[PDB]
Amino acid sequence: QGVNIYNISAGTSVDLAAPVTTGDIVTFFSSALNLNAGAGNPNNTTLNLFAENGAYLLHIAFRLQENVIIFNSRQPDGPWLVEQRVSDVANQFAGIDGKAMVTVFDHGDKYQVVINEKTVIQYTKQISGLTSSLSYNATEETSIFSTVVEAVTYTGLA
Amino acid sequence: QGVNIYNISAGTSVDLAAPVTTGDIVTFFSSALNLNAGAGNPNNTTLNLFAENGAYLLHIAFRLQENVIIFNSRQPDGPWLVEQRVSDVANQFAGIDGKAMVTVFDHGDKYQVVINEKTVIQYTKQISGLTSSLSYNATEETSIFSTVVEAVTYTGLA
Ligand SMILES: OC[C@H]1O[C@@H](O)[C@H](O)[C@@H](O)[C@H]1O
Numbered sequence: 001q002g003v004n005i006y007n008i009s010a011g012t013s014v015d016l017a018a019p020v021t022t023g024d025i026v027t028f029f030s031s032a033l034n035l036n037a038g039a040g041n042p043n044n045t046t047l048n049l050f051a052e053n054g055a056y057l058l059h060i061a062f063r064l065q066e067n068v069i070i071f072n073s074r075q076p077d078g079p080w081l082v083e084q085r086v087s088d089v090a091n092q093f094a095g096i097d098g099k100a101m102v103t104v105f106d107h108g109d110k111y112q113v114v115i116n117e118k119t120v121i122q123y124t125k126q127i128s129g130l131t132s133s134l135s136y137n138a139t140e141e142t143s144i145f146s147t148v149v150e151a152v153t154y155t156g157l158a
Numbered sequence: 159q160g161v162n163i164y165n166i167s168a169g170t171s172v173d174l175a176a177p178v179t180t181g182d183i184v185t186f187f188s189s190a191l192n193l194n195a196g197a198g199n200p201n202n203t204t205l206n207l208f209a210e211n212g213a214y215l216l217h218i219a220f221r222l223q224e225n226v227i228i229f230n231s232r233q234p235d236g237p238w239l240v241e242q243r244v245s246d247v248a249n250q251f252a253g254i255d256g257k258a259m260v261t262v263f264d265h266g267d268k269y270q271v272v273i274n275e276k277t278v279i280q281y282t283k284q285i286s287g288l289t290s291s292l293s294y295n296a297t298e299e300t301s302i303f304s305t306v307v308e309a310v311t312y313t314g315l316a
Contacts, residue, residue, distance in 0.1 A: 001263070001270070002272070002275075002277075003259075003261050003272045003274070003275050004275055005254070005259075005274060005275055023315075025183075025312060027161075027310075096163070101161075101163075101310070103161050103312075105159065112159070114160060114161050116161070116163060117160070117161055117162060117163055119160060152185075152259075154183060154261075154312070157181070157315060
């Protein structure tokens with residue numbers, strides 16, 4: 001029942017006018033792909049969905065040198081929980097180059113992550129709640145995405 | 159439940175691998191916005207949703223000369239039906255510049271059309287059914303959108 005657009009500058013965060021909850025959708029749009037960027041720290045790029053208290057509902061980290069895409073969560077001031085892994089980063093973006101899109105479906109019990117058309121994981125949540133903020137973290141030097149990524153939300157669907 | 163990406167060239171149509179039904183979403187992305195493109199004939203740009211028999215479930219037309227946006231439907235062979243229109247094109251796009259996106263929510267009994275974050279209309283259907291294909295008609299010379307439009311679909315939502 002509603003669309004929202006956010007330009008997220010590399011290394012910043014954004015508060016949602018409308019929170020993302022069960023049945024809602026969020027897609028991050030990048031106008032570039034640099035699968036040949038520098039060494040991650042260890043992350044080249046990360047995309048996150050936060051809850052009101054600041055907890056990491058979903059942590060999406062892209063690492064070229066480690067050639068893996070990690071997923072995890074963690075309480076506001078606690079340790080990282082059980083992380084999930086998907087090897088071969090460049091392979092998840094196959095089919096499209098020059099740009100890319102990362103979608104996260106809030107399925108209530110899980111976070112379905114899809115890169116372009118390919119579902120990368122059915123991430124069972126380790127932490128529950130509603131998403132009230134998003135972030136795109138990376139340096140201008142080593143990000144695999146454009147300096148500014150556009151987050152599009154589709155809320156009020158259920 | 160997933161995502162599908164289609165690169166549509168002005169004047170062509172495309173068949174959906176995943177049909178769009180009640181509870182589903184389609185968004186056309188344009189990488190430009192020329193509001194000085196010239197006069198339509200009478201249309202500058204049109205975006206359409208088709209049933210399997212060719213009928214126009216939803217027809218959206220942008221006309222700069224008439225400074226109005228049109229919505230309608232019609233059977234493969236029948237005549238256009240009751241035209242629904244909204245004035246001031248530029249106003250609908252106010253907010254973002256070198257680009258634009260148009261979203262359509264299939265609400266079963268209505269198609270909600272949102273430009274960027276602005277709902278332009280809650281279109282009561284004149285014809286119902288699932289969307290089997292899409293199209294984007296315009297010429298290079300007067301289209302208000304980029305020469306190639308990217309439609310993205312989110313299906314299996316309901
Ligand atoms: O009612 C919608 C129709 O309006 C006509 O005037 C136009 O020639 C058609 O292309 C279609 O847009």
